[PDB]
Structure 1
Amino acid sequence: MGSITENTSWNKEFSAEAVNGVFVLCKSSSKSCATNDLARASKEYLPASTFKIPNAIIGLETGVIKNEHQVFKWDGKPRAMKQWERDLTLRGAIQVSAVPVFQQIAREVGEVRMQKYLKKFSYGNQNISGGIDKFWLEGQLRISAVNQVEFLESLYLNKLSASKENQLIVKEALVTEAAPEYLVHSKTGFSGVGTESNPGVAWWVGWVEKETEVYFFAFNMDIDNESKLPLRKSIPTKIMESEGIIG
């Protein structure tokens, strides 16, 4: 990362909702970032479903995902969300956030190759302890909002230690809004409601391409009640709108 400046006026959008969280927003052309909370911007949290981004790249790199058009077939047995009970493409599995597809990717990648690529990607604390299929869900892996924006900038630039083709495949799978001069790539996550005195984490990370500028973003918040989940999009959206970053 370049420079980061704390702007505590952005806490307005958090206090209104009694949210403890952080937003990091970086403008590519000026090599500068801003945050409501410098200390929290570097604090590391479970990646939860945001881990689909590195995991998809790693699955392609290792050949476990055979190519961009692989279909992940449903075995017909119960899955935890109805939206996952179907065959899915790579983009569909990312977009509906189908955990079992990505747990099996991780199993097939295996611990040695997973460790290798998280070290190459400088991905968080790089700690894959807790089981090959769940280290990023309930194990020891942790990543900060600063590190998310660094990782996403590298992906945007095709500068991760992976083929350019595999980075491009994952990028199209992450498009969530497309207009002529406005394109958003993004991914949500939610580790759960935590335990007593130990909240869960909710995430929204991504980047916005508006005309010839690019803005990288990462939001996280403590969460202990699922009713608060939409704040992971609404608070960053309000901040980005106040910065003029909008269709």
Structure 2
Amino acid sequence: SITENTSWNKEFSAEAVNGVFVLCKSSSKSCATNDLARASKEYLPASTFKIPNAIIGLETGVIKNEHQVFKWDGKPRAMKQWERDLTLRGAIQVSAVPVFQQIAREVGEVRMQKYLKKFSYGNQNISGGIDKFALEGQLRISAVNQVEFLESLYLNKLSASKENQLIVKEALVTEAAPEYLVHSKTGFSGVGTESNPGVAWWVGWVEKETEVYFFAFNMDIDNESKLPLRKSIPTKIMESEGII
């Protein structure tokens, strides 16, 4: 069940953003959204794919453990912040694409397909090359599917050891307050065109008191200056919902 909440529209209009926010209290059996249609529309995951990629990396033994350090070979990487040794949490938090490209290569297409089928992850379409299907290939996932996936992860219900799910959940912590804890991941496929915008994501969950809130935000983006809106729009909504 997905219910439309019209009051959330104001955050989108004020910024002239075409986007969707899906928010679910307790569980994904009853989510709310600004846009029913877009809630289930499927977009490139981009770096939000680091969440299942990290779990799969761990499950297959490609990532040896929680403490593995991904060493930089000294060769140029697309962003300077990726040019350094990284922990799993570090590689996730700076969205170190080439670290995860190599994890994916080692996982391989057969195992990647299998796990995306186990995880019910989007259209499960990994075509486009093993090291780029989430960024420029055919893989698509909706805000609703993101939230279902994240809930399973939260409950340790994915087809993966509890251990590996905890390892990844810790790597996803992005805000700690006395009141609440935020686990989240951003994604950004690029700017595309005016006529064919890229997509920007912020997905995760918030634990406040004894409650949990699963969230997925996405927006069309054709200009990188608009990127911070992927956090300020959903944060504003959750602030006024009294969540963060």
- Shorter-chain TM-score: which interval? over 0.9
Which blocks of at least 5 consecutive residues in structure 2 are unaligned? Answer: none
Residue 59 of structure 1: aligned partner: 57
More off after superposition, 28-37 vs 111-120: 28-37
Give the superposition deviation at 1:242: 1.0
Provide the TM-score with structure 1 as the length reference: 0.97
Contact 2:28 2:214 in 1 (8 A): no
**Correspondence 1:201 to 2:203:** no
Which residue pairs with 1:7 in the alignment? 5
Task: Tell me the CA shift for residue 9 of structure 1.
Answer: 1.7
Q: 1:30 to 1:54 in 2, by over 3 A?
A: closer
Runs of 4+ in structure 1 deviating by more than 4 angstroms, as ranges, are none
Structure 1 30/140 Cα, relative in aligned 2: closer, same or farther at 3 Å? closer
Deviation sequence 1:32-56 (CA, Å, 0-9, x none): 2100000000000000000000000
When residues 197 and 11 of structure 1 are mapped into structure 2, their CA distance, relative to the original with a 3 A threshold, is same
Shift of 1:214: 0.1
Q: Deviations over 1:9-34 (max 9, x none)?
A: 21110001110000000001694210
The answer as to whether partners of 2:182 and 2:206 remain within 8 angstroms in 1 is yes
Q: Cα gap change, 1:205/1:29 in structure 2, threshold over 3 Å: closer, same or farther?
A: closer
Contact kept in structure 2, 1:50 and 1:187, CA below 8 Å: yes
After superposition, what is the alpha-carbon deviation per residue over 1:48-96, rounded to whole angstroms, capped at 9, x for unaligned? Answer: 0000000000000000001111110001011111111000001110011
Which has the higher mean CA deviation after the structures are superposed, 6-15 or 29-38? 29-38
Is the contact between residue 28 and residue 151 of structure 2 (CA under 8 Å) also seen in structure 1?
no
Give the conservation status (yes or no) of the 8 Å contact 1:158–1:167.
yes
Counting matched residue pairs gives: 244
Deviation readout 1:92-146 (Å, 9 max, x if unpaired) = 1001110000000000000000000000000000000000000000000000000
RMSD: 1.0
Please identify, of 172-181 and 86-95, the stretch whose mean Cα deviation from structure 2 is larger. 172-181
Tell me the percent identity.
100
Matched-pair contact (CA < 8 Å) for 1:24–1:146: yes
Mean alpha-carbon deviation: is it higher for 196-205 or for 147-156? 196-205
Counterpart contact for 1:29–1:213, Cα < 8 Å:
no
**Any conservation in 1 of the 2:202–2:217 contact (CA below 8 Å)?**
yes
| 2:52 is equivalent to residue 70 of structure 1 | no
1:195: Cα distance to partner? 2.8
What secondary structure, in the 3-state scheme, does the structure 1 residue paired with 2:215 have? strand
Distance 2:136 2:28 in 1: 37
C-alpha distance in structure 2 between counterparts of 1:100 and 1:31, whole Å: 36
Distance 2:241 2:175 in 1: 19
The answer on whether the counterparts of 2:147 and 2:216 sit within 8 Å (CA) in structure 1 is: yes
| Structure 1 residue 179 displacement after superposition | 2.7
Aligned-pair CA distance for 1:196: 4.7
TM-score (structure 2 length as normaliser): 0.98
CA distance in 1, matches of 2:155, 2:214: 12
